[PDB]
RNA sequence: GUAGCGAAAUUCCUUGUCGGGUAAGUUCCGACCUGCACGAAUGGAGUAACGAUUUCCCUACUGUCUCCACCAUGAACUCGGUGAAAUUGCAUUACGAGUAAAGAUGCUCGUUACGCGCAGCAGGACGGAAAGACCCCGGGACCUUUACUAUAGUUUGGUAUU
RNA sequence: CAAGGGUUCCAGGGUCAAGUUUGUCUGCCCUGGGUGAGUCGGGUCCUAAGGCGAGGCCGACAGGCGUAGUCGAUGGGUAACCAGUUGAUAUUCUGGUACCGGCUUGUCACCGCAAGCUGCGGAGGGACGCAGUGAGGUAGCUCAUCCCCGGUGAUGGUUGUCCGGGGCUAAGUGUGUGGACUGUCUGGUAGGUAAAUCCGCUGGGCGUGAAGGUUGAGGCAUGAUGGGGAGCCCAUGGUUGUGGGUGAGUGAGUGAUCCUGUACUGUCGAGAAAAGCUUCGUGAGCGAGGUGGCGGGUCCGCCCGUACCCUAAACCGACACUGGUGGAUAGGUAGAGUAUACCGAGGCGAUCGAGUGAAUCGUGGUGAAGGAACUCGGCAAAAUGCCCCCGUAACUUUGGGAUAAGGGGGACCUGAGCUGUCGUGCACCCGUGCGGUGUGGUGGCGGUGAGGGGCGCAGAGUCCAGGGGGAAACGACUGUUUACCAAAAACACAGGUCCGUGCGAAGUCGUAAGACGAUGUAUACGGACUGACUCCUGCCCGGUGCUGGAA
RNA sequence: GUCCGAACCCACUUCAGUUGAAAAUGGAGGGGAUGAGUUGUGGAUAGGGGUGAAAGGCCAAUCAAACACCGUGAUAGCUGG
């Protein structure tokens, strides 16, 4: 059937992209937390 | 007028439609249109603040001159009478005798070719716009300004009518279509005559679809909701509200006008009653 | 408690009573009113048309049935290849009448039974799957209100702005 | 093709793993290779929804909103086609022939408070719904005694039209047939943010009763002496390609979902924006007496994508999963059809098999007599089914009910006449040299056919394809709903009533500013209940609520 | 918001499946099919909140208050060890 994940690169980049995260202070703190943890992927 | 539909199909059975006899032109003036995207009843916060709004046929806004006093003394010919989807009245397209074209609410009785004018020395004819000090007492006007220079705000819908009853001092007393008696500044402008298309209220839409493309979404009455959704919600089987009638937000029925504002200019309340 | 309607999606008694339909009708349709406990915009009574709605009947039609038979196929079955699953205290795991935590393969007294497989059927192992969803007790959640205590909001007056 | 995937694509080597079996094979592994654009799809251009937002306003802080702006396609704008080639790429490379923008150059013509260029805006334009019919075309398709290239048949016949195949070419340019568009010459001018000679609004003169002009469905010409297109050659090389051998390009029927066409007609629910573009000036600067125009020549033309899968074994579903996935093309015969049956272009034989008349389960098939006796219940199945013609009840809101019900005919052979269209041809208007027009043609093709006839159990012979009637309850109706046990009598609904709201509306979101309501104004808006329509809607204000009043 | 009927959308009945081909489907029928239709792309509304032709429905395969992390080794007169 139609499943939950329907990919769209533009929507993904607008939602979880680096600039989207940098727009708000919550996203900036998320990037900081991922940097502290050591993720190689800071954002989508 | 109104044209009654024949009962060929259900939903067309009791319905009716205006015959559009007064329209002289089936297209609008291109230079007086702006885009009017739909809101769906949503706020600038993106939430529904006015319910029951959405969908409907696409519409283009017609720029209506509700001031009329920046063309004082310039006669205009009523070039056309045409349809405005944004209102229950018709719109008269006016060709001023200087090249400027404009739109007004079409007064009842005016048609293609008649000459309208604005100003204190304007003649008292339907469609002419004058200050209230110059409009004679006992006259039926429309498109009345609350504050001088603010533009038309009262008596604008189809068939609307305002009665000028007195001009004592620096205030003119007007009976609004609600029947309320109100005082306004004599310098406030008004257009002679009443609004046309007065018979549109008798239109039977006869069809859920016609309001659906008029832009009205279905209305779910609160008594068939759940208690979390509406104070009238709940109950086993069909019930009443289980309480006195209230709004979906728990506000009891009652007068809601702010008792302390411009009440010093209201002579008597509308007196709907029964 | 009016018009209207009434054993009704409402009638407990109840398969009320009478009438129609059937060879036979607790359902049905028309009546009666004795309305346990109808009723007029939480609308009353009707209503052509509409309905994958509910109910009754007639006709046509048939394997629905009397009453099943036969045919072909995908599994099943045999051979070669590949190869799981839930479950699992144990094992060389009968029946009868008993007995016992009151329903026994396992205890008593008897009876029967050579060892091991294959295809099958589901009576039992209180079979498997889900720390019963009913009940009660403890806790929680959400909902309600003329429960308590508060509060946003709305409103009153004072005072500052004055 | 898009989305998504990301090297799966190609060649060679490999068979541990993966593949529901095997495997020499692979979408697997290993190595190397493969994607070429001024025109295609995006960016360099434009805006929609929406996002962000200099200042700004609002908010203890954090922040909210928003102006000027600036982004943002799913839309607007925008110049190229055919053929050929590779193991893998092709509106990209190559061939042929075009187009667009620059730079530069040759030549001709022209300007000069007064060139031009660039900014800046004005106006025009871009620019818009839904539904329907018809007309003129073309694509396509069919047929052919016509033109080509073959064939003469394993078994009776098969050298005449008997059989098979083919009967082709683009963008661009020119032409201007249908069709469409369009009076002309001057004057004035409260408007178009600064202006306008470009617009708008108005005054006159003349004016066919259309005549020119402008335009451009197709056709023709050109592009094209080219390209493409079968079987004959010493030969090739023997699952091969080379050089010659390419032959034809006819006519009719039928006919679009395409073109004219945003046409035309109908219609209420009244159907984006902005830029490019044309023109107008000048609220800006540049700029010399140098530019700007029309034909001709040279060079310059950027970035990203381009392989491959893609109604799927490569995407979304943990799988190489009977599921889901937007768009384009979509031939023949029977048919109303994009249904269905069998076929075409093309692609597949499906990723464990071999057997064997067990019971049994699934999936189909048939059935004597009976025909709902089954069962909670006609559940399932059967019957009915198509077209044409005849005919059709209670009731009704006059529309319906209705395909009511209930009947007849259908295919095959032959076939008189009637028609669609074309036709060499007759005469004729000819504006002929018109790409024409009306009479008019033995005929070809197609459609339709009264009548007559044949055969069978059966002629809508297969697939496909309503059972019908009577009555009651509920809801008027079409719709909507518990994704994953309830589709209903529930919700909605059109209609109705009451209450609120005089506009900074009430109401709602928010701390606020603001916003929706609404660029609406009481014939409106918000809330409540009721729920088409018909006839109606009684009595009670004590209680509670609401409204008003204030001793 | 006509009728019959494909695509398309739906999900009424039945059978099968129910360690499925499939964490909701398949076969046979069935409803809508010019409309309150359906669908693509992008966008908006966010957790006591959204949205809801209203079923407490839906909000990333279990919603009478999502998910993740944190307070946190919550607490449990209860069950187990
Ligand atoms: C008519 O009486 N019969 C005997 C009962 C019954 C009959 C038919 C059914 O189809 C179901 C049930 C019981 C309910 C129980 C429900 C319950 N829940 C509502 C709290 C629950 O606890 C679970 C669960 N997941 O544990 C469920 O399954 C549940 O939701 C569900 O679906 C049910 C059913 O399907
Ligand atoms: Mg998801
Ligand atoms: Mg314009
Ligand atoms: Mg915001
Ligand atoms: Mg509403
Ligand atoms: Mg409106
Ligand atoms: Mg409910
Ligand atoms: Mg509440
Ligand atoms: Mg309630
Ligand atoms: Mg009750
Ligand atoms: Mg009885
Ligand atoms: Mg009883
Ligand atoms: Mg009886
Ligand atoms: Mg009453
Ligand atoms: Mg009542
Ligand atoms: Mg009642
Ligand atoms: Mg009712
Ligand atoms: Mg009733
Ligand atoms: Mg009825
Ligand atoms: Mg139904
Ligand atoms: Mg019978
Ligand atoms: Mg088998
Ligand atoms: Mg085996
Ligand atoms: Mg005992
Ligand atoms: Mg025993
Ligand atoms: Mg024993
Ligand atoms: Mg022992
Ligand atoms: Mg055994
Ligand atoms: Mg067995
Ligand atoms: Mg057993
Ligand atoms: Mg058990
Ligand atoms: Mg327990
Ligand atoms: Mg449970
Ligand atoms: Mg259970
Ligand atoms: Mg509690
Ligand atoms: Mg919970
Ligand atoms: Mg105060
Ligand atoms: Mg004070
Ligand atoms: Mg790629
Ligand atoms: Mg590789
Ligand atoms: Mg790979
Ligand atoms: Mg490969
Ligand atoms: Mg293997
Ligand atoms: Mg290999
Ligand atoms: Mg290989
Ligand atoms: Mg730019
Ligand atoms: Mg914007
Ligand atoms: Mg700032
Ligand atoms: Mg820009
Ligand atoms: Mg952009
Ligand atoms: Mg390729
Ligand atoms: Mg090519
Ligand atoms: Mg080339
Ligand atoms: Mg402009
Ligand atoms: Mg427009
Ligand atoms: Mg022979
Ligand atoms: Mg041929
Ligand atoms: Mg001027
Ligand atoms: Mg000016
Ligand atoms: Mg035609
Ligand atoms: Mg490529
Ligand atoms: Mg390719
Ligand atoms: Mg394909
Ligand atoms: Mg698949
Ligand atoms: Mg996968
Ligand atoms: Mg045919
Ligand atoms: Mg088919
Ligand atoms: Mg083939
Ligand atoms: Mg394929
Ligand atoms: Mg496989
Ligand atoms: Mg066997
Ligand atoms: Mg059968
Ligand atoms: Mg037989
Ligand atoms: Mg029989
Ligand atoms: Mg028989
Ligand atoms: Mg019979
Ligand atoms: Mg019986
Ligand atoms: Mg029986
Ligand atoms: Mg049935
Ligand atoms: Mg059948
Ligand atoms: Mg009829
Ligand atoms: Mg009939
Ligand atoms: Mg005949
Ligand atoms: Mg027959
Ligand atoms: Mg047929
Ligand atoms: Mg009755
Ligand atoms: Mg009854
Ligand atoms: Mg209904
Ligand atoms: Mg209704
Ligand atoms: Mg329905
Ligand atoms: Mg829906
Ligand atoms: Mg369901
Ligand atoms: Mg209403
Ligand atoms: Mg307010
Ligand atoms: Mg506003
Ligand atoms: Mg109701
Ligand atoms: Mg009283
Ligand atoms: Mg009272
Ligand atoms: Mg009071
Ligand atoms: Mg319909
Ligand atoms: Mg689809
Ligand atoms: Mg269901
Ligand atoms: Mg089952
Ligand atoms: Mg229907
Ligand atoms: Mg978004
Ligand atoms: Mg409930
Ligand atoms: Mg969910
Ligand atoms: Mg909570
Ligand atoms: Mg909620
Ligand atoms: Mg703590
Ligand atoms: Mg503990
Ligand atoms: Mg325990």
Cα-to-centroid distance, A3 and ligand 103 (Å):
26
Task: Quote the CA–CA distance of B272 and B274 in Å, as a whole number.
Answer: 7
Q: Is residue B197 left, alpha or beta, with left meaning phi > 0 and alpha meaning psi from -120 to 50? A: left
CB atoms within 10 A of CB B112: 14
Nucleotides of C under 7 A from a protein CB: 42-43, 48-49, 142-145, 155-156
- How many independent structural domains does chain A possess? 1
CA angle B141, B142, B147 (to 5 degrees): 105
- In angstroms, the CA of B70 and the C1' of D316 are apart by 63
Q: What residue has token string 């995207």? A: B37
Nearest nucleotide (CA of B66 to C1'): D519
Which two three-digit tokens encode residue B107? 């007064």
Task: Quote the CA–CA distance of B166 and B115 in Å, as a whole number.
Answer: 28
Which two three-digit tokens encode residue B23? 């329209």
Task: Quote the CA–CA distance of A22 and A16 in Å, as a whole number.
Answer: 10
Q: Which residues contact B200 (CB under 8 A, 6 or more apart)?
A: B2, B18, B88, B158, B159
CA angle B95, B100, B102 (to 5 degrees): 65
Task: Quote the CA–CA distance of B57 and B38 in Å, as a whole number.
Answer: 10
Q: Which residues contact B243 (CB under 8 A, 6 or more apart)?
A: B231, B232
Cα-to-centroid distance, B207 and ligand 19 (Å):
22
- In angstroms, the CA of B40 and the C1' of D126 are apart by 30
Burial class (CB in 10 A: 0-12, 13-18, 19+), B102: buried
Overall residue count recorded for chain A in this entry:
44
- The ligand placed nearest to the CA atom of residue B30 is 55
Domain carrying residue A8: 1-44
In this structure, what is the dihedral angle of CA atoms B240, B241, B246, B250, given to the nearest 10 degrees?
-170
Return the bridge partners of B195, or none: B107
Q: Measuring CA to CA, which residue among B169, B219, B216, B167 is closest to residue B190?
A: B167
Q: What is the 3-state secondary structure of chain B?
A: CEEECCCCCCCCCCCEEECCCCCECCCCCHHHEEECCCCCCECCCCCECCCCECCCCCCEEECCCCCCHHHCCCCEEEEEEEECCCCCCEEEEEEECCCCEEEEECECCCCCCCEECECCCCCCCCCCEEECCCCCCCCEEECEECCCCCCEEECCCCCCCEEEEECCCCEEEEECCCCCEEEEECCCEEEECCECCCCHHHCCCCCHHHHHHHCECCCCCHHHCCCCCCCCCCCCCCCCCCCCCECCCCCECCCCCCCCCCHHHEEECCCCCC
Q: What residue has token string 């039977």? A: B204
Is the distance from CB of B149 to CB of B186 less than 8 angstroms? no
Is the distance from CB of B130 to CB of B190 less than 8 angstroms? yes
Which two three-digit tokens encode residue B243? 């309480």
Task: Quote the CA–CA distance of B15 and B204 in Å, as a whole number.
Answer: 5
Which pairs count as long-range contacts for B120-124, CB under 8 Å and 24+ apart, including other chains? B120/B72, B121/B73, B124/B192
Overall residue count recorded for chain B in this entry:
274
Helix (H) or strand (E) holding A9: helix A9-16
Is the distance from CB of B42 to CB of B50 less than 8 angstroms? no
Nucleotides of D under 7 A from a protein CB: 3-5, 48-52, 62-66, 123-125, 127, 189-192, 199-202, 267-273, 315-317, 323-325, 397-399, 476-478, 490-495, 498-510, 514-517, 519-533, 544-548
Instruction: Walk across the sheet containing B181-185 and list its strands.
Output: B129-131, B189-192, B140-142, B162-166, B171-175, B181-185, B266-268
Exp. method? cryo-EM
Q: Measuring CA to CA, which residue among B217, B227, B132, B223 is closest to residue B182?
A: B132
Task: Quote the CA–CA distance of B91 and B114 in Å, as a whole number.
Answer: 14
- How far is residue B137 from each of residues B118, B120, B164, measured CA to CA in Å? 18, 15, 6
Task: Quote the CA–CA distance of B138 and B196 in Å, as a whole number.
Answer: 19
């Amino acid at each position: 059937m139609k499943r939950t994940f329907q990919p769209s690169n533009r929507r993904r980049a607008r939602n979880h992209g680096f600039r989207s995260r940098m727009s708000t202070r919550a996203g900036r703190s998320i990037l900081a937390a991922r940097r502290r943890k050591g993720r190689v992927n800071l954002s989508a | 007028g109104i044209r009654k539909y024949k009962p060929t199909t259900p939903g067309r059975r009791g319905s009716s439609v205006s015959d559009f006899v007064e329209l002289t032109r089936s297209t609008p003036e291109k230079s007086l249109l702006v885009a009017k995207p739909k809101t769906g009843g949503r706020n600038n916060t993106g939430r529904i603040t006015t319910r029951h709004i959405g969908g409907g046929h696409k519409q283009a806004y017609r720029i209506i001159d509700f001031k009329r006093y920046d063309k004082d003394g310039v006669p205009a010919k009523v070039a056309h009478i045409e349809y405005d989807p944004n209102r229950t009245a018709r719109i008269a397209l006016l060709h001023y005798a200087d090249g400027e074209k404009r739109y007004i609410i079409a007064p009842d009785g005016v048609g293609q070719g008649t000459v309208v004018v604005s100003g204190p020395e304007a003649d008292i004819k339907p469609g002419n716009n004058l200050p209230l000090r110059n409009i004679p007492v006992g006259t039926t006007v429309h498109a009345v300004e609350l504050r001088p220079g603010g533009g038309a705000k009262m008596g604008r819908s189809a068939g609307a009518s305002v009665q000028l009853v007195a001009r004592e001092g620096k205030y003119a007393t007007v009976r609004l279509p609600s029947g309320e008696m109100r005082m306004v500044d004599i310098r406030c402008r008004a257009t002679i005559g009443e609004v046309g298309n007065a018979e549109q209220i008798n239109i039977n839409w006869g069809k859920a679809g016609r309001n659906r493309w008029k832009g009205i979404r279905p209305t779910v009455r609160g008594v068939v909701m759940n208690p979390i959704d509406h104070p009238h919600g709940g109950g086993e089987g069909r019930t009443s509200g289980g309480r006195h009638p209230v709004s979906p937000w728990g506000k009891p029925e009652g007068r809601t006008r702010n008792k302390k504002k411009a009440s010093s200019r209201l002579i008597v309340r509308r007196r709907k009653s029964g």
